[PDB]
């Protein structure tokens, strides 16, 4: 399984998600989904996973 995210939702935070199995992070950061006006439509969780 691989998580699925939007490009703008993770830009600048790839190095934390790349090493989540070696280092022992207290948490993982992510942004929310925003539309063209700047309103929040979805949460900070990944959209889904592959099967």
Min separation Cβ 17 and another protein, Å: 8
Q: Does 23 bind a second copy (CB under 8 A)?
A: no
Q: Does 22 bind a second copy (CB under 8 A)?
A: no
Closest CA to 8 of 39, 33, 37: 33
Separation between Cα atoms, residue 36 and residue 22, nearest integer Å: 37
Q: Does 44 bind another protein (CB under 8 A)?
A: no
Min separation Cβ 37 and another protein, Å: 6
Q: Does 49 bind a second copy (CB under 8 A)?
A: yes
Separation between Cα atoms, residue 3 and residue 47, nearest integer Å: 8
């Amino acid at each position: 399984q691989i998580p699925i995210v939007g490009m703008e939702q993770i830009r600048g935070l790839e190095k934390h998600w790349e090493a989540r199995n070696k280092k022992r992070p207290a948490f993982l950061p992510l942004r929310e989904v925003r539309d063209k006006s700047g309103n929040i439509i979805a949460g900070a969780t990944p959209a889904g996973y592959t099967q």
